[PDB]
From a paper:
DEP domain-containing mTOR interacting protein (DEPTOR), conserved in vertebrates, modulates the activity of the serine/threonine kinase mammalian target of rapamycin (mTOR), a master regulator of cell growth. mTOR acts in two functionally distinct multiprotein complexes, mTOR complex 1 (mTORC1) and mTORC2, and DEPTOR is the only protein reported to bind and inhibit both mTOR complexes. DEPTOR is a 46 kDa protein comprising an N-terminal DEP (Dishevelled, Egl-10, and Pleckstrin) domain tandem, herein referred to as DEPt, and a C-terminal PDZ (postsynaptic density 95, disks large, zonula occludens-1) domain. The PDZ domain binds tightly with mildly activating effect, but then acts as an anchor for DEPt association that allosterically suppresses mTOR activation.
The core architecture of the cryo-EM reconstructions of the two mTOR complexes in association with DEPTOR largely resembles that of their DEPTOR-free states. DEPTOR binds to mTORC1 and mTORC2 in virtually identical manner via its extended PDZ-linker and DEP domain tandem (DEPt) regions associating with the FAT domain of mTOR. Indeed, we observe weak residual density in the DEPTOR-mTORC1 complex at a binding site for helical peptide segments of substrates and the inhibitor PRAS40 on the FRB domain, which might represent a dynamically interacting segment of DEPTOR or copurified interacting proteins. Indeed, such an alternative, substrate-like weak interaction is indicated by residual density observed here in a known substrate recruitment site for mTORC1.
Numbering used by the authors:
A (entry chain E): 374 to 469
B (entry chain J): 304 to 409
C (entry chain E): 277 to 325
D (entry chain B): 17 to 30, 37 to 53, 60 to 74, 82 to 156, 162 to 223, 233 to 246, 258 to 289, 304 to 317, ...
E (entry chain B): 1408 to 1758
F (entry chain A): 1056 to 1143
């Protein structure tokens, strides 16, 4: 219940349904959330200093979810390859 | 007629470089101010000092108008354009180490 | 539940009636409702792992 | 606040006493008045050092006041006539602190001390000298008020056979002659040369040096710097956080000095000390016979002891002043330095070797004994400034200096402290050292070692792609973060956190490092908490996935402390914290700006000064971040702020009030229209220019008149009998009419209460002298006079009724219109009181 | 009646904000004393810059050149804005001049260099201005923003405000009217603050321009004050990037009886000189500018040519409207009709 | 207060912010002999449970100052420490 990721869920909800007055009444085009983009940005920052066998990146299952769409598929496939490059320990994680 | 030239000496190249004779070198360290140092260098090859603010810190520590410089904040600028020297002094620290040729009334 | 917490002060003009009339579906990830469902699936699968 | 205040008073009376006076000054920073006067009097009469510590400290911080000045002036006037040494100089420092307070009584107090100082010119004579010396530095204007008595009395009193006077009175003459030059000199040179023609040696030489030294600052500016021994292109933050005769007689000045240096060679230590100070400054004015007389005394004083310190200082100035001719005496000077160093005082020897270069290749061989002396702050300051001026072998300098540091750090406490200060002060060319320094701070129980080893490692990681270096930086920075979170001593925790600058933000944005930083946002010390939220806010661009969720949770808590905590300090701390968030994480806060602003406006309409000051500084930072989304609230905040600007009753400072108003007008773009809505705006802002004394505040009051634009004078016009009496009447009528008019003005308002008796005695005398022509004035006088009787109290009532009786006797039949009111008055104020009964019956 | 009395009478009237009375004093001087008794300084006080220049020219022709008459004539040139002639007099006379007049020269020489856009000359002149003056701080802060020395710029502005303390306080004591001059100095200072933001925040640009436009309209319609303000904003905004400012400016020059300056302004906005190519048709790009030029030409008594241009222009407008009317450009079409309507009205009244 | 907390349970967090100002004043100036009114208020905070989530940052500093103050008596310090134990 007290995991940090829960705080991210609140912000994601907040930004998503702050637009609802404008979507319903004004008819504004629903801009997509930066969530998945920003989560890939966090994974990229991890890769920069990821050589050591430290705690694995929290966002690994998010990278999986990003592969399902096309909007961020190119960026994820790049980062996922760079991660697998780090070593065979990482490829084991991605398979698990 | 747009540019202004206040330097009587037409050229000083190859005359400075020769040791001794007309001038004796001196190094002036000028501290920055709230509104600026107050000196201008407008010499093409020798980078002679164009003007000095009489009320500025530079005029208090010597720095007469009829002078030539060859090095700023350590870096030797004996042969560069005046505009390039203006870039170096602004991009450098607040306090500037300057070498003045300081011709001895000749 | 989000609309019952104290954090609603941060979004004035968000009542339950707006939540009832949220546009989209739970399948179409390009809609607002499908966006949240997709995000939620990622966040929950991340906490678990 | 009384018993324990007197308990610690006798404690400080009987290092520990200075800290008890600093804590008393720190307690006076927050802070009854009678008990402080009694506590000061308790410490005064008893010991004398603690009494001066009590007086001076309170006056400076609590502020000089008419009550405090009148009382403590008698205490200071009692100490001066007779006191011990050391205590006298402390009492003279309490004069200087009082004289720089900036009060109206300062003009009287300073001129009281100066006039009595001239009367004296031994605890009397040296006291007057310290008073005049400190006042000459602190107060140039009133020191110049008595210059002709100054020179005449002092040239008599200086040459008396005393040492303490000669030390201070020349420093007073120094402070005086500097003020005379920038704005006497013949009378100075006459009395100085009269004195020269062994007590009458070292004083004349100092007076002659004053004319030499002031005429040429080049000599003094070298001595002044040796005694002590950002960028213009930077982009400002996008959100602004809240904030002649001395040259003509100079020839004879050195002429009588060249002979004095030979005359007073070893006559009556003190004279030799002043000679070796003066000789270089005289030579720097005019350098061979003058040099030969100098060199004989200087070179002989270097071999001797108790002067070697000042001898090299003169020798270093002589080497710079006399360039070529000094080169003959190089073998003499260098042999003495080569003999002086092996014994290890020599901190000055190195300073003068730096001034000797201020060069030859011989210095390369001179380095191997120099470094063998040892680590001193003078040595490393010299070698640093040596590579500045002559960078011929800067690599060889760093080679030997790093070899010295390596020999040291391969191997008590205070030396390791200074060795780390050296290692982190100036640049160097370091992996093992830093991984070994990671061991020292963890395994040191010394607070000062940990605090310095932290400052050192943070400085030595300025070189921050190689995997090994990254893994090393990651290891060290993880250990540093652990120390910054876990160390008990909060000073060490604050230093470490402050040292984690922009440079490290690439590493701090790692998950593990960010989990540590979050813990740090709940530190016991509010100041550390402030610094942590700034760092995390700055990282909200690097790793938004972590930082943005966490700052939202923190924002909720901040707004909870604001709204629901009913406590000044907690609310003040919460506002301050929201300040740092707005500035460092503006993207996060932009969607939530309307909630925050409503919460803050509600705080502004609540019925502690620092809370409103921090709330205003936050609203001002929101203005810039809002980016035109706060327009709907601008007219609300404008009313609030204009309500707070007018009057000085409001606790909140006008400065920050005016600053936040500036930021609103600027960002939101409310120009010209506010002038129409609030017409007093131009009258309020031109009133600060006539009232405010602070520059910063006056500066803002202009910057806000700037942003609001320059209103057209017509647009501002749209936005907003005594001579006549004489013009008509003859003078014999005019005089009653003007007298009455002048009395009627006093009759209204509370001014009448002070002058109740005199006003009505006049009006009665006027009516009696006029006769029946006073009837004219009846409609003016009566309604006021009756309302005065209504609101008057006590004794005046009876007197007014007495004088009303006189009035009625003069007016006679004409009083009929006002008679009904008079009866009502009588009916209301008739009491069984015997006094008023006799009065009313007469009326 | 004495000349000294008349001079003092003029200065008293200006302090009392009664310009018309002081002008009447000069008319009295003209009649009863002629012209020799009228010094050029009298025109300078009355802001008769055209007649003051004629006076200083007549005086400098007969009398030998003097520091006082040179500065007087140069002061007139800067008020008119003839930056070409003012910079010519500077470059000619530098070594010929003493250091006392030098400090009274550079404040005007820098203004001229800034106007012409020659930044090397401007740097030389600003150093000669004394730092203790308000202007000395202001002009140093301007050369800061040209070189992007933002940190030093803010420093110099603060000292400039500090030096305006003495001026603002003195003028405020005796009515708002006298304080207006100081008020304009702070206006230009706070505008220089909003040029630093303009050079740092691309997102804030259109907001700053709207603020600038609304601020200038609250300011008084004096041409001198506008020239100062527009020269400042021109540090980061070319005249083409904001037409309506420079068109309203030209209109003031027209109403104030300075059509020469109005003409130069309009030529600079048009892009070319119609005055030179009389046979060619007027350029259609920027039509609101062209229209302003024609109604200026009419005031210049070239009213047969103006009328002919208007006939050509409206034929061009109505053809440019018809062919370019799509659904997209509806706001442009609405502004083009509002223009064409005013064109047709001018056609009529002119006919 | 203790009886309202057990009665409402989860719904108490709506009303707790009104009571917080008085509870924070109790800690600042408690003149109770041996601060037994403070000890009682600690025992109440234990019942508050997961209600304190949104307000723990407010309550905790007073509690922390309570068990770290040496002037304060040992019973009241044990009561504060045992409270933090439970709330954990
Ligand atoms: O001087 P005019 O020939 O009579 O022209 C005026 C004048 O325009 P200019 O800016 O070119 O001088 C008005 O401006 P003001 O100087 O009075 O401020 C302007 O009015 P606005 O400022 O409201 O636009 C008005 O325009 P309009 O007819 O749309 O009201 C316009 O008239 P013409 O264009 O018809 O000559």
């Amino acid at each position: 219940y007290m995991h940090a990721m829960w705080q991210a869920w609140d912000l994601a909800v907040d930004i998503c349904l702050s637009q609802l007055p404008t979507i319903i009444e004004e008819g504004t085009a629903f801009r997509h959330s930066p969530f998945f983009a920003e989560q890939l940005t966090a994974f990229q920052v991890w890769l920069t200093m990821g050589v050591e066998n430290r705690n694995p990146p929290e966002q690994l299952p998010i990278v999986l979810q990003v592969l399902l769409s096309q909007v961020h598929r190119l960026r994820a496939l790049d980062l996922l390859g760079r991660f697998l490059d780090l070593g065979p320990w990482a490829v084991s994680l991605a398979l698990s | 007629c747009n540019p202004k030239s206040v330097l009587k000496r037409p050229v000083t190249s190859e005359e400075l470089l020769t040791p001794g004779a007309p001038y004796a070198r001196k190094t002036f360290t000028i501290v920055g101010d709230a509104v600026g140092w107050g000196f201008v260098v407008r010499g093409s090859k020798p980078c002679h000092i164009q003007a000095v603010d009489p009320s500025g810190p530079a005029a208090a520590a010597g720095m007469k108008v009829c002078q030539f410089v060859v090095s700023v904040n350590g870096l030797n600028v004996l042969h560069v354009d005046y505009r390039t020297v203006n870039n170096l002094i602004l991009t450098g620290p607040r306090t500037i180490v300057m070498e003045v040729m300081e011709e001895l009334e000749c | 539940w989000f609309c019952m917490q104290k954090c609603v002060s941060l979004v004035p003009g968000v009542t339950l009636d707006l939540i009832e009339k949220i546009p989209g579906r739970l399948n179409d990830r390009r809609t607002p409702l499908g966006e949240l469902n997709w995000i939620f699936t990622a966040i929950t699968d991340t906490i678990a792992w | 606040x009384x018993x324990x205040x007197x308990x610690x008073x006798x404690x400080x009376x009987x290092x520990x006493x200075x800290x008890x006076x600093x804590x008393x000054x720190x307690x006076x920073x927050x802070x009854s008045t009678r008990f402080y006067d009694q506590l000061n009097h308790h410490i005064f009469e008893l010991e004398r050092k603690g009494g001066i510590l009590a007086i001076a400290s309170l006056i400076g911080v609590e502020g000089g006041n008419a009550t405090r000045i009148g009382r403590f002036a008698n205490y200071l006037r009692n100490l001066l006539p007779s006191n011990d040494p050391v205590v006298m100089e402390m009492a003279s420092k309490a004069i200087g602190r009082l004289a720089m307070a900036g009060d109206t009584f300062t003009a009287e107090y300073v001129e009281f001390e100066v006039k009595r100082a001239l009367e004296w010119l031994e605890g009397r004579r040296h006291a007057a000298v310290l008073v005049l010396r400190e006042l000459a530095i602190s107060v140039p204007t009133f020191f110049f008020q008595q210059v002709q008595p100054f020179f005449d009395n002092i040239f008599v009193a200086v040459w008396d056979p005393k040492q303490a006077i000669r030390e201070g009175a020349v420093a007073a003459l120094r402070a005086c002659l500097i003020l005379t030059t920038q704005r006497w000199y013949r009378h100075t040179f006459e009395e100085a040369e009269k004195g020269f023609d062994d007590d009458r040696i070292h004083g004349a030489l100092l007076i002659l040096n004053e004319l030499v030294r002031i005429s040429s600052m080049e000599g003094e500016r070298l001595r002044e710097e040796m005694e002590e021994i950002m960028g213009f292109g930077t982009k400002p933050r996008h959100i602004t956080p809240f904030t002649x005769x001395x040259x003509x007689x100079x020839x004879x000045x050195x002429x009588x000095x060249x002979x004095x240096x030979x005359x007073x060679x070893x006559x009556x230590s003190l004279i030799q000390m002043t000679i070796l100070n003066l000789l270089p400054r005289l030579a720097a004015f005019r350098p061979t016979q003058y040099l030969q007389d100098t060199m004989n005394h200087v070179l002989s004083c270097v071999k001797k002891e108790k002067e070697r310190t000042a001898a090299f200082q003169a020798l270093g100035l002589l080497s710079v002043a006399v360039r070529s001719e000094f080169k003959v005496y190089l073998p003499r000077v260098l042999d003495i330095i080569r003999a002086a160093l092996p014994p290890k005082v020599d901190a000055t020897v190195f300073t003068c070797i730096s001034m000797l270069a201020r060069i030859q290749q011989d210095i390369k061989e001179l380095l191997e004994p120099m470094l063998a002396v040892g680590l001193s702050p003078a040595l490393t300051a010299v070698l640093y400034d040596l590579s500045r001026q002559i960078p011929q072998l800067k690599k060889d300098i760093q080679d030997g200096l790093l070899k010295m540091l390596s020999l040291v750090l391969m191997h008590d406490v205070g030396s390791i402290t200074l060795a780390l200060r050296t290692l982190g002060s100036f640049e160097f060319e370091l992996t093992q050292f830093v991984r070994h320094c990671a061991d020292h701070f963890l395994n040191s129980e010394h607070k000062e070692i940990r605090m310095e080893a932290a400052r050192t490692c943070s400085r030595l990681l300025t070189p921050s792609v190689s995997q090994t270096a990254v893994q090393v930086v990651a290891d060290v920075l993880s250990k540093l973060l652990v120390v910054g979170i876990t160390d008990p001593d909060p000073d060490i925790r604050y230093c470490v956190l402050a040292s984690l600058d922009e440079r490290f933000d690439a590493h701090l944005a790692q998950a593990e490092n960010l989990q540590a930083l979050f813990v740090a946002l709940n530190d016991q010390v509010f100041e550390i908490r402030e610094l942590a939220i700034c760092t995390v806010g700055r990282l909200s661009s690097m790793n938004p996935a972590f930082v943005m969720p966490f700052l939202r949770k923190m924002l909720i808590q901040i707004l909870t402390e604001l709204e629901h905590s009913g406590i000044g300090r907690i609310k003040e701390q919460s506002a301050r914290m929201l300040g740092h968030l707005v500035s460092n994480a503006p993207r996060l806060i932009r969607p939530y700006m309307e909630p925050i602003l409503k919460a803050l406006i509600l705080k502004l309409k609540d019925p502690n000064p620092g809370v409103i000051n921090n709330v205003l500084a936050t609203i001002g930072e929101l203005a810039q971040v809002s980016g035109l989304e706060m327009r709907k609230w601008v007219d609300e905040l404008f009313i609030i702020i204009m309500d707070m600007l007018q009057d000085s009753s409001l606790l909140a400072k006008r400065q920050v009030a005016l600053w936040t108003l500036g930021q609103l007008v600027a960002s939101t773009g409310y120009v010209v229209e506010p002038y129409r809505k609030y017409p007093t705006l131009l009258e309020v802002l031109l009133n600060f220019l006539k009232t405010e004394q602070n520059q910063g505040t006056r500066r803002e009051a202009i910057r806000v008149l700037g942003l609001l634009g320059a209103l057209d004078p017509y647009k501002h016009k749209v936005n907003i009998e005594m001579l006549v009496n004489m013009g008509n009447l003859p003078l014999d009528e005019f005089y009653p009419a003007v007298s009455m008019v002048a009395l009627m003005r006093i009759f209204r308002d509370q001014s009448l209460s002070h002058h109740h008796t005199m006003v009505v005695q006049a009006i009665t005398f006027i009516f009696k002298s006029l006769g029946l022509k006073c009837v004219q004035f009846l409609p003016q006088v009566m309604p006021t006079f009756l309302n005065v009787i209504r609101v008057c109290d006590g004794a005046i009532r009876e007197f007014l009724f007495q004088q009303l009786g006189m009035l009625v006797s003069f007016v006679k039949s004409h009083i009929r219109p006002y008679m009904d009111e008079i009866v009502t008055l009588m009916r209301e104020f008739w009491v069984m009181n015997t006094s008023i009964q006799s009065t009313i019956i007469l009326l | 009646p004495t000349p000294a009395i008349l001079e003092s009478l003029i200065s008293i009237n200006n302090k009392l904000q009664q310009p018309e009375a002081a002008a009447g004093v000069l008319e009295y001087a003209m009649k009863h004393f002629g012209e020799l008794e009228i010094q050029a300084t009298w025109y300078e006080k009355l802001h008769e810059w055209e007649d003051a220049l004629v006076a200083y020219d007549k005086k400098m022709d007969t009398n030998k050149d003097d520091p006082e008459l040179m500065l007087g004539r140069m002061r007139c040139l800067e008020a008119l804005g003839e930056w070409g002639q003012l910079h010519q007099q500077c470059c000619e006379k530098w070594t010929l001049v003493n250091d006392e007049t030098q400090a009274k020269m550079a404040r005007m020489a820098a203004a001229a260099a800034w106007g012409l856009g020659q930044w090397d000359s401007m740097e030389e002149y600003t150093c000669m201005i004394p730092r203790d003056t308000h202007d000395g701080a202001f002009y140093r802060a301007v050369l800061a923003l040209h070189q992007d020395l933002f940190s030093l710029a803010q420093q110099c502005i603060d000292k400039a405000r500090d030096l305006l303390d003495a001026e603002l306080t003195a003028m405020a004591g005796e009515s708002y009217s006298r304080a207006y001059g100081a008020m304009v100095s702070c206006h230009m200072l706070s505008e220089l603050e909003e040029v630093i933001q303009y050079k740092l925040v691309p997102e804030r640009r259109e907001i700053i321009r709207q603020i600038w436009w609304e601020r200038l309209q609250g300011c008084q319609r004096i041409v001198e004050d506008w020239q100062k303000i527009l020269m400042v904003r021109s540090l980061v905004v070319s005249p083409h990037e904001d037409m309506r400012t420079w068109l309203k400016y030209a209109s003031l020059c027209g109403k104030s009886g300075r059509l020469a300056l109005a003409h130069k302004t309009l030529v600079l906005l048009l892009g070319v000189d119609p005055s030179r190519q009389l046979d060619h048709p007027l350029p259609t790009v920027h039509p609101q500018v062209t229209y302003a030029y024609m109604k200026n030409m009419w005031k210049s008594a070239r009213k047969i040519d103006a009328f002919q241009h208007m006939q050509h222009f409206v034929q061009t407008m109505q053809q440019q409207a018809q062919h370019a009317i799509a659904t997209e450009d509806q706001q442009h079409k609405q502004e083009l009709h509002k223009l064409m309507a005013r064109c047709f009205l001018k056609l009529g009244e002119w006919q | 207060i203790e009886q309202i907390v057990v009665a409402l349970g989860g719904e108490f967090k709506l009303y707790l912010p009104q009571l917080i100002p008085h509870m924070l004043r109790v800690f600042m100036h408690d003149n109770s002999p041996g601060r037994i009114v403070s000890i009682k208020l600690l025992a109440a905070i234990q019942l508050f449970g997961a209600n304190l989530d949104d307000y723990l940052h407010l309550l905790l500093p007073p509690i922390v100052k309570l068990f770290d103050a040496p002037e304060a008596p040992l019973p009241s310090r044990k009561a504060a420490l045992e409270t933090v134990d439970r709330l954990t």
